[PDB]
């Protein structure tokens, strides 16, 4: 099926790659460390007028 | 760390006034209510006076009204109690109080923490 026929002659033939290999997905990123100061504005004792 | 330190107490004579101070550390002062409580020997506890962040609301007990005055300054980070015409009932262990809701009372969340 890589020569696209049903009869092949004597000799050596250089075929292709038709086998299918399953794959996964992965992702990596640095360490989240420097958070924003949301507590000071959302958890303040007194809010301005 | 949160501490409240009281100073200025001592022994006085009738007709003589004194100055109490409440210096504290470890928390921001400009948004908290502060109050005074005294502890005389073996008669429970009773309230003296209080203050809030804006100091617009100031209250005294009627038994002690007219001869105390509470004051506070942010720059010096301390609470002040002014006495006038000290009498016999004044003999007690005075406590300095901080609130948790920047106001005197009435709100759902209020309480004496330190
Ligand atoms: C403003 O302040 C309030 C109150 O301080 C805050 O709400 C609190 O957030 C914390 C965030 O951790 C909550 O704590 C969690 O509580 C649940 C149960 O309610 C627990 O299951 C959680 O346990 C996990 O995390 C632990 C580490 O803390 C792990 O050891 C554990 O194994 C679990 O993985 C966790 O303790 C807390 O319940 C709330 N409280 C209220 C009343 O909502 C709010 O987030 C602050 N707002 C801002 C914007 O910061």
mmCIF file of N, CA, C and O in Angstrom, chain B residues 3-89:
data_model
loop_
_atom_site.group_PDB
_atom_site.id
_atom_site.type_symbol
_atom_site.label_atom_id
_atom_site.label_comp_id
_atom_site.label_asym_id
_atom_site.label_seq_id
_atom_site.Cartn_x
_atom_site.Cartn_y
_atom_site.Cartn_z
ATOM 1 N N UNK B 3 0.338 44.311 72.459
ATOM 2 C CA UNK B 3 0.356 44.590 73.888
ATOM 3 C C UNK B 3 -0.247 45.963 74.134
ATOM 4 O O UNK B 3 -0.208 46.840 73.266
ATOM 5 N N UNK B 4 -0.807 46.138 75.328
ATOM 6 C CA UNK B 4 -1.257 47.435 75.812
ATOM 7 C C UNK B 4 -0.618 47.682 77.170
ATOM 8 O O UNK B 4 -0.719 46.840 78.068
ATOM 9 N N UNK B 5 0.040 48.829 77.316
ATOM 10 C CA UNK B 5 0.778 49.164 78.528
ATOM 11 C C UNK B 5 0.145 50.401 79.146
ATOM 12 O O UNK B 5 -0.047 51.413 78.462
ATOM 13 N N UNK B 6 -0.176 50.318 80.433
ATOM 14 C CA UNK B 6 -0.783 51.421 81.162
ATOM 15 C C UNK B 6 0.235 52.054 82.103
ATOM 16 O O UNK B 6 1.060 51.360 82.704
ATOM 17 N N UNK B 7 0.170 53.378 82.226
ATOM 18 C CA UNK B 7 1.115 54.127 83.041
ATOM 19 C C UNK B 7 0.451 55.402 83.542
ATOM 20 O O UNK B 7 -0.582 55.839 83.027
ATOM 21 N N UNK B 8 1.064 56.001 84.562
ATOM 22 C CA UNK B 8 0.572 57.224 85.158
ATOM 23 C C UNK B 8 -0.151 57.048 86.476
ATOM 24 O O UNK B 8 -0.440 58.050 87.141
ATOM 25 N N UNK B 9 -0.450 55.815 86.874
ATOM 26 C CA UNK B 9 -1.140 55.582 88.123
ATOM 27 C C UNK B 9 -0.245 55.798 89.330
ATOM 28 O O UNK B 9 0.979 55.893 89.238
ATOM 29 N N UNK B 10 -0.883 55.874 90.487
ATOM 30 C CA UNK B 10 -0.179 56.082 91.734
ATOM 31 C C UNK B 10 -1.142 56.507 92.824
ATOM 32 O O UNK B 10 -2.351 56.342 92.700
ATOM 33 N N UNK B 11 -0.558 57.004 93.927
ATOM 34 C CA UNK B 11 -1.358 57.463 95.096
ATOM 35 C C UNK B 11 -1.545 58.975 95.016
ATOM 36 O O UNK B 11 -0.557 59.677 94.740
ATOM 37 N N UNK B 12 -2.759 59.451 95.265
ATOM 38 C CA UNK B 12 -3.123 60.860 95.178
ATOM 39 C C UNK B 12 -3.930 61.268 96.403
ATOM 40 O O UNK B 12 -4.405 60.417 97.164
ATOM 41 N N UNK B 13 -4.090 62.571 96.596
ATOM 42 C CA UNK B 13 -4.844 63.155 97.692
ATOM 43 C C UNK B 13 -6.163 63.714 97.176
ATOM 44 O O UNK B 13 -6.296 64.010 95.982
ATOM 45 N N UNK B 14 -7.169 63.853 98.041
ATOM 46 C CA UNK B 14 -8.441 64.441 97.601
ATOM 47 C C UNK B 14 -8.243 65.855 97.074
ATOM 48 O O UNK B 14 -7.440 66.630 97.598
ATOM 49 N N UNK B 15 -8.988 66.184 96.021
ATOM 50 C CA UNK B 15 -8.845 67.461 95.358
ATOM 51 C C UNK B 15 -7.675 67.556 94.404
ATOM 52 O O UNK B 15 -7.434 68.637 93.853
ATOM 53 N N UNK B 16 -6.940 66.467 94.194
ATOM 54 C CA UNK B 16 -5.780 66.443 93.315
ATOM 55 C C UNK B 16 -6.056 65.525 92.133
ATOM 56 O O UNK B 16 -6.584 64.422 92.309
ATOM 57 N N UNK B 17 -5.699 65.980 90.938
ATOM 58 C CA UNK B 17 -5.891 65.216 89.715
ATOM 59 C C UNK B 17 -4.595 64.518 89.310
ATOM 60 O O UNK B 17 -3.515 64.789 89.840
ATOM 61 N N UNK B 18 -4.720 63.602 88.354
ATOM 62 C CA UNK B 18 -3.599 62.801 87.879
ATOM 63 C C UNK B 18 -3.798 62.548 86.388
ATOM 64 O O UNK B 18 -4.853 62.857 85.826
ATOM 65 N N UNK B 19 -2.776 61.990 85.738
ATOM 66 C CA UNK B 19 -2.817 61.726 84.301
ATOM 67 C C UNK B 19 -2.551 60.243 84.075
ATOM 68 O O UNK B 19 -1.518 59.726 84.512
ATOM 69 N N UNK B 20 -3.472 59.562 83.400
ATOM 70 C CA UNK B 20 -3.234 58.191 82.973
ATOM 71 C C UNK B 20 -2.916 58.139 81.484
ATOM 72 O O UNK B 20 -3.426 58.931 80.688
ATOM 73 N N UNK B 21 -2.058 57.190 81.115
ATOM 74 C CA UNK B 21 -1.665 56.984 79.731
ATOM 75 C C UNK B 21 -1.762 55.504 79.389
ATOM 76 O O UNK B 21 -1.549 54.639 80.242
ATOM 77 N N UNK B 22 -2.088 55.221 78.129
ATOM 78 C CA UNK B 22 -2.161 53.853 77.622
ATOM 79 C C UNK B 22 -1.353 53.767 76.336
ATOM 80 O O UNK B 22 -1.849 54.123 75.263
ATOM 81 N N UNK B 23 -0.118 53.294 76.443
ATOM 82 C CA UNK B 23 0.719 53.070 75.276
ATOM 83 C C UNK B 23 0.646 51.608 74.851
ATOM 84 O O UNK B 23 0.740 50.690 75.667
ATOM 85 N N UNK B 24 0.483 51.400 73.548
ATOM 86 C CA UNK B 24 0.309 50.072 72.983
ATOM 87 C C UNK B 24 1.205 49.912 71.764
ATOM 88 O O UNK B 24 1.732 50.896 71.234
ATOM 89 N N UNK B 25 1.398 48.665 71.342
ATOM 90 C CA UNK B 25 2.263 48.337 70.220
ATOM 91 C C UNK B 25 1.764 47.080 69.525
ATOM 92 O O UNK B 25 1.049 46.270 70.123
ATOM 93 N N UNK B 26 2.142 46.926 68.259
ATOM 94 C CA UNK B 26 1.859 45.720 67.509
ATOM 95 C C UNK B 26 0.671 45.778 66.578
ATOM 96 O O UNK B 26 0.458 44.824 65.821
ATOM 97 N N UNK B 27 -0.108 46.855 66.602
ATOM 98 C CA UNK B 27 -1.274 46.954 65.736
ATOM 99 C C UNK B 27 -1.451 48.400 65.301
ATOM 100 O O UNK B 27 -0.993 49.319 65.983
ATOM 101 N N UNK B 28 -2.091 48.590 64.149
ATOM 102 C CA UNK B 28 -2.359 49.932 63.650
ATOM 103 C C UNK B 28 -3.427 50.597 64.510
ATOM 104 O O UNK B 28 -4.482 50.010 64.764
ATOM 105 N N UNK B 29 -3.160 51.825 64.949
ATOM 106 C CA UNK B 29 -4.029 52.494 65.912
ATOM 107 C C UNK B 29 -5.203 53.226 65.279
ATOM 108 O O UNK B 29 -6.246 53.352 65.929
ATOM 109 N N UNK B 30 -5.073 53.705 64.045
ATOM 110 C CA UNK B 30 -6.011 54.676 63.501
ATOM 111 C C UNK B 30 -7.379 54.083 63.189
ATOM 112 O O UNK B 30 -8.313 54.838 62.908
ATOM 113 N N UNK B 31 -7.524 52.752 63.212
ATOM 114 C CA UNK B 31 -8.831 52.113 63.062
ATOM 115 C C UNK B 31 -9.042 51.030 64.134
ATOM 116 O O UNK B 31 -9.020 49.832 63.855
ATOM 117 N N UNK B 32 -9.380 51.479 65.346
ATOM 118 C CA UNK B 32 -9.807 50.634 66.460
ATOM 119 C C UNK B 32 -10.464 51.484 67.539
ATOM 120 O O UNK B 32 -10.074 52.636 67.753
ATOM 121 N N UNK B 33 -11.462 50.929 68.219
ATOM 122 C CA UNK B 33 -12.042 51.602 69.368
ATOM 123 C C UNK B 33 -11.309 51.204 70.648
ATOM 124 O O UNK B 33 -10.945 50.042 70.855
ATOM 125 N N UNK B 34 -11.093 52.189 71.514
ATOM 126 C CA UNK B 34 -10.380 51.998 72.768
ATOM 127 C C UNK B 34 -11.256 52.448 73.934
ATOM 128 O O UNK B 34 -12.039 53.394 73.822
ATOM 129 N N UNK B 35 -11.108 51.760 75.067
ATOM 130 C CA UNK B 35 -11.986 51.977 76.211
ATOM 131 C C UNK B 35 -11.199 51.841 77.507
ATOM 132 O O UNK B 35 -10.089 51.302 77.524
ATOM 133 N N UNK B 36 -11.790 52.347 78.592
ATOM 134 C CA UNK B 36 -11.208 52.244 79.926
ATOM 135 C C UNK B 36 -12.109 51.425 80.842
ATOM 136 O O UNK B 36 -13.332 51.608 80.851
ATOM 137 N N UNK B 37 -11.498 50.522 81.607
ATOM 138 C CA UNK B 37 -12.175 49.710 82.611
ATOM 139 C C UNK B 37 -11.300 49.679 83.857
ATOM 140 O O UNK B 37 -10.077 49.546 83.756
ATOM 141 N N UNK B 38 -11.915 49.817 85.031
ATOM 142 C CA UNK B 38 -11.180 49.725 86.283
ATOM 143 C C UNK B 38 -11.630 48.500 87.070
ATOM 144 O O UNK B 38 -12.778 48.057 86.973
ATOM 145 N N UNK B 39 -10.703 47.958 87.861
ATOM 146 C CA UNK B 39 -10.955 46.766 88.669
ATOM 147 C C UNK B 39 -10.651 47.086 90.126
ATOM 148 O O UNK B 39 -9.489 47.050 90.544
ATOM 149 N N UNK B 40 -11.689 47.409 90.892
ATOM 150 C CA UNK B 40 -11.538 47.554 92.325
ATOM 151 C C UNK B 40 -11.603 46.183 92.995
ATOM 152 O O UNK B 40 -12.195 45.246 92.453
ATOM 153 N N UNK B 41 -10.989 46.037 94.170
ATOM 154 C CA UNK B 41 -10.915 44.712 94.802
ATOM 155 C C UNK B 41 -12.289 44.147 95.138
ATOM 156 O O UNK B 41 -13.036 44.712 95.939
ATOM 157 N N UNK B 42 -12.609 43.014 94.507
ATOM 158 C CA UNK B 42 -13.756 42.180 94.874
ATOM 159 C C UNK B 42 -15.083 42.931 94.769
ATOM 160 O O UNK B 42 -15.909 42.908 95.684
ATOM 161 N N UNK B 43 -15.295 43.608 93.641
ATOM 162 C CA UNK B 43 -16.609 44.159 93.318
ATOM 163 C C UNK B 43 -16.899 44.003 91.830
ATOM 164 O O UNK B 43 -17.632 44.799 91.233
ATOM 165 N N UNK B 44 -16.343 42.961 91.218
ATOM 166 C CA UNK B 44 -16.602 42.716 89.810
ATOM 167 C C UNK B 44 -15.837 43.674 88.921
ATOM 168 O O UNK B 44 -14.706 44.075 89.218
ATOM 169 N N UNK B 45 -16.461 44.046 87.804
ATOM 170 C CA UNK B 45 -15.853 44.941 86.832
ATOM 171 C C UNK B 45 -16.890 45.960 86.379
ATOM 172 O O UNK B 45 -18.090 45.678 86.329
ATOM 173 N N UNK B 46 -16.414 47.159 86.043
ATOM 174 C CA UNK B 46 -17.301 48.223 85.587
ATOM 175 C C UNK B 46 -16.571 49.083 84.567
ATOM 176 O O UNK B 46 -15.343 49.197 84.613
ATOM 177 N N UNK B 47 -17.356 49.674 83.656
ATOM 178 C CA UNK B 47 -16.790 50.466 82.534
ATOM 179 C C UNK B 47 -16.593 51.925 82.924
ATOM 180 O O UNK B 47 -17.407 52.437 83.713
ATOM 181 N N UNK B 48 -15.584 52.570 82.343
ATOM 182 C CA UNK B 48 -15.282 53.966 82.640
ATOM 183 C C UNK B 48 -15.627 54.857 81.453
ATOM 184 O O UNK B 48 -16.514 55.714 81.540
ATOM 185 N N UNK B 49 -14.927 54.659 80.338
ATOM 186 C CA UNK B 49 -15.056 55.529 79.178
ATOM 187 C C UNK B 49 -14.478 54.813 77.968
ATOM 188 O O UNK B 49 -13.840 53.764 78.093
ATOM 189 N N UNK B 50 -14.712 55.393 76.790
ATOM 190 C CA UNK B 50 -14.247 54.806 75.555
ATOM 191 C C UNK B 50 -14.056 55.849 74.471
ATOM 192 O O UNK B 50 -14.384 57.024 74.634
ATOM 193 N N UNK B 51 -13.507 55.387 73.347
ATOM 194 C CA UNK B 51 -13.221 56.228 72.191
ATOM 195 C C UNK B 51 -13.180 55.334 70.955
ATOM 196 O O UNK B 51 -12.985 54.122 71.046
ATOM 197 N N UNK B 52 -13.384 55.946 69.789
ATOM 198 C CA UNK B 52 -13.344 55.244 68.514
ATOM 199 C C UNK B 52 -12.241 55.834 67.645
ATOM 200 O O UNK B 52 -11.464 56.686 68.082
ATOM 201 N N UNK B 53 -12.176 55.365 66.396
ATOM 202 C CA UNK B 53 -11.114 55.807 65.497
ATOM 203 C C UNK B 53 -11.247 57.292 65.182
ATOM 204 O O UNK B 53 -10.257 58.032 65.185
ATOM 205 N N UNK B 54 -12.473 57.748 64.909
ATOM 206 C CA UNK B 54 -12.682 59.153 64.578
ATOM 207 C C UNK B 54 -12.825 60.010 65.827
ATOM 208 O O UNK B 54 -12.783 61.242 65.738
ATOM 209 N N UNK B 55 -13.010 59.381 66.988
ATOM 210 C CA UNK B 55 -13.202 60.037 68.279
ATOM 211 C C UNK B 55 -14.430 60.935 68.308
ATOM 212 O O UNK B 55 -14.583 61.732 69.244
ATOM 213 N N UNK B 56 -15.315 60.835 67.313
ATOM 214 C CA UNK B 56 -16.516 61.662 67.308
ATOM 215 C C UNK B 56 -17.520 61.198 68.355
ATOM 216 O O UNK B 56 -18.271 62.016 68.896
ATOM 217 N N UNK B 57 -17.547 59.904 68.652
ATOM 218 C CA UNK B 57 -18.434 59.341 69.661
ATOM 219 C C UNK B 57 -17.627 59.056 70.920
ATOM 220 O O UNK B 57 -16.694 58.245 70.897
ATOM 221 N N UNK B 58 -17.983 59.729 72.012
ATOM 222 C CA UNK B 58 -17.307 59.571 73.294
ATOM 223 C C UNK B 58 -18.377 59.413 74.366
ATOM 224 O O UNK B 58 -19.296 60.234 74.452
ATOM 225 N N UNK B 59 -18.266 58.363 75.176
ATOM 226 C CA UNK B 59 -19.264 58.102 76.193
ATOM 227 C C UNK B 59 -18.697 57.861 77.576
ATOM 228 O O UNK B 59 -17.611 57.291 77.721
ATOM 229 N N UNK B 60 -19.426 58.293 78.601
ATOM 230 C CA UNK B 60 -19.055 58.072 79.990
ATOM 231 C C UNK B 60 -20.234 57.482 80.751
ATOM 232 O O UNK B 60 -21.397 57.667 80.383
ATOM 233 N N UNK B 61 -19.920 56.760 81.825
ATOM 234 C CA UNK B 61 -20.959 56.318 82.743
ATOM 235 C C UNK B 61 -21.448 57.497 83.575
ATOM 236 O O UNK B 61 -20.680 58.402 83.911
ATOM 237 N N UNK B 62 -22.743 57.486 83.906
ATOM 238 C CA UNK B 62 -23.331 58.621 84.612
ATOM 239 C C UNK B 62 -22.735 58.794 86.003
ATOM 240 O O UNK B 62 -22.680 59.917 86.518
ATOM 241 N N UNK B 63 -22.286 57.703 86.627
ATOM 242 C CA UNK B 63 -21.678 57.810 87.949
ATOM 243 C C UNK B 63 -20.339 58.534 87.882
ATOM 244 O O UNK B 63 -19.941 59.211 88.838
ATOM 245 N N UNK B 64 -19.626 58.397 86.765
ATOM 246 C CA UNK B 64 -18.314 59.010 86.596
ATOM 247 C C UNK B 64 -18.352 60.192 85.633
ATOM 248 O O UNK B 64 -17.301 60.739 85.288
ATOM 249 N N UNK B 65 -19.540 60.599 85.191
ATOM 250 C CA UNK B 65 -19.659 61.672 84.215
ATOM 251 C C UNK B 65 -19.337 63.018 84.864
ATOM 252 O O UNK B 65 -19.581 63.250 86.051
ATOM 253 N N UNK B 66 -18.775 63.919 84.061
ATOM 254 C CA UNK B 66 -18.544 65.283 84.489
ATOM 255 C C UNK B 66 -17.198 65.529 85.136
ATOM 256 O O UNK B 66 -16.845 66.678 85.418
ATOM 257 N N UNK B 67 -16.431 64.466 85.378
ATOM 258 C CA UNK B 67 -15.118 64.597 85.999
ATOM 259 C C UNK B 67 -14.068 63.683 85.372
ATOM 260 O O UNK B 67 -12.962 63.566 85.912
ATOM 261 N N UNK B 68 -14.385 63.036 84.251
ATOM 262 C CA UNK B 68 -13.394 62.366 83.421
ATOM 263 C C UNK B 68 -13.455 62.928 82.009
ATOM 264 O O UNK B 68 -14.465 63.491 81.581
ATOM 265 N N UNK B 69 -12.349 62.763 81.287
ATOM 266 C CA UNK B 69 -12.251 63.220 79.902
ATOM 267 C C UNK B 69 -11.262 62.311 79.188
ATOM 268 O O UNK B 69 -10.095 62.236 79.583
ATOM 269 N N UNK B 70 -11.727 61.616 78.157
ATOM 270 C CA UNK B 70 -10.867 60.719 77.396
ATOM 271 C C UNK B 70 -10.321 61.454 76.178
ATOM 272 O O UNK B 70 -11.021 62.253 75.544
ATOM 273 N N UNK B 71 -9.052 61.205 75.863
ATOM 274 C CA UNK B 71 -8.413 61.817 74.710
ATOM 275 C C UNK B 71 -7.397 60.842 74.133
ATOM 276 O O UNK B 71 -6.911 59.946 74.827
ATOM 277 N N UNK B 72 -7.083 61.029 72.853
ATOM 278 C CA UNK B 72 -6.188 60.135 72.137
ATOM 279 C C UNK B 72 -5.508 60.900 71.010
ATOM 280 O O UNK B 72 -6.104 61.777 70.379
ATOM 281 N N UNK B 73 -4.245 60.558 70.763
ATOM 282 C CA UNK B 73 -3.479 61.176 69.692
ATOM 283 C C UNK B 73 -2.770 60.090 68.897
ATOM 284 O O UNK B 73 -2.180 59.173 69.475
ATOM 285 N N UNK B 74 -2.832 60.204 67.568
ATOM 286 C CA UNK B 74 -2.238 59.185 66.706
ATOM 287 C C UNK B 74 -0.719 59.312 66.656
ATOM 288 O O UNK B 74 -0.008 58.301 66.631
ATOM 289 N N UNK B 75 -0.204 60.545 66.649
ATOM 290 C CA UNK B 75 1.233 60.746 66.497
ATOM 291 C C UNK B 75 2.006 60.132 67.658
ATOM 292 O O UNK B 75 3.051 59.503 67.456
ATOM 293 N N UNK B 76 1.509 60.307 68.880
ATOM 294 C CA UNK B 76 2.147 59.779 70.074
ATOM 295 C C UNK B 76 1.719 58.344 70.377
ATOM 296 O O UNK B 76 2.221 57.743 71.334
ATOM 297 N N UNK B 77 0.804 57.786 69.579
ATOM 298 C CA UNK B 77 0.383 56.387 69.663
ATOM 299 C C UNK B 77 0.027 55.963 71.087
ATOM 300 O O UNK B 77 0.455 54.912 71.571
ATOM 301 N N UNK B 78 -0.812 56.748 71.753
ATOM 302 C CA UNK B 78 -1.180 56.409 73.119
ATOM 303 C C UNK B 78 -2.570 56.942 73.423
ATOM 304 O O UNK B 78 -3.033 57.894 72.790
ATOM 305 N N UNK B 79 -3.219 56.325 74.404
ATOM 306 C CA UNK B 79 -4.536 56.729 74.869
ATOM 307 C C UNK B 79 -4.381 57.462 76.191
ATOM 308 O O UNK B 79 -3.556 57.075 77.025
ATOM 309 N N UNK B 80 -5.170 58.515 76.384
ATOM 310 C CA UNK B 80 -5.033 59.378 77.548
ATOM 311 C C UNK B 80 -6.355 59.450 78.295
ATOM 312 O O UNK B 80 -7.420 59.529 77.673
ATOM 313 N N UNK B 81 -6.283 59.421 79.623
ATOM 314 C CA UNK B 81 -7.446 59.606 80.481
ATOM 315 C C UNK B 81 -7.194 60.796 81.397
ATOM 316 O O UNK B 81 -6.169 60.849 82.087
ATOM 317 N N UNK B 82 -8.121 61.748 81.403
ATOM 318 C CA UNK B 82 -7.997 62.962 82.200
ATOM 319 C C UNK B 82 -8.906 62.855 83.419
ATOM 320 O O UNK B 82 -10.118 62.663 83.279
ATOM 321 N N UNK B 83 -8.322 62.977 84.606
ATOM 322 C CA UNK B 83 -9.081 62.970 85.847
ATOM 323 C C UNK B 83 -9.215 64.385 86.396
ATOM 324 O O UNK B 83 -8.330 65.227 86.224
ATOM 325 N N UNK B 84 -10.340 64.635 87.061
ATOM 326 C CA UNK B 84 -10.579 65.899 87.739
ATOM 327 C C UNK B 84 -11.356 65.625 89.018
ATOM 328 O O UNK B 84 -12.364 64.917 89.003
ATOM 329 N N UNK B 85 -10.875 66.198 90.122
ATOM 330 C CA UNK B 85 -11.512 66.056 91.432
ATOM 331 C C UNK B 85 -11.633 64.585 91.829
ATOM 332 O O UNK B 85 -12.728 64.031 91.949
ATOM 333 N N UNK B 86 -10.480 63.948 92.025
ATOM 334 C CA UNK B 86 -10.447 62.533 92.373
ATOM 335 C C UNK B 86 -11.091 62.293 93.734
ATOM 336 O O UNK B 86 -10.867 63.041 94.689
ATOM 337 N N UNK B 87 -11.898 61.233 93.817
ATOM 338 C CA UNK B 87 -12.640 60.927 95.035
ATOM 339 C C UNK B 87 -12.358 59.508 95.518
ATOM 340 O O UNK B 87 -11.489 58.820 94.974
ATOM 341 N N UNK B 88 -13.097 59.067 96.540
ATOM 342 C CA UNK B 88 -12.807 57.784 97.176
ATOM 343 C C UNK B 88 -13.100 56.612 96.247
ATOM 344 O O UNK B 88 -12.386 55.603 96.269
ATOM 345 N N UNK B 89 -14.152 56.719 95.431
ATOM 346 C CA UNK B 89 -14.565 55.590 94.602
ATOM 347 C C UNK B 89 -13.543 55.286 93.511
ATOM 348 O O UNK B 89 -13.584 54.217 92.893
#
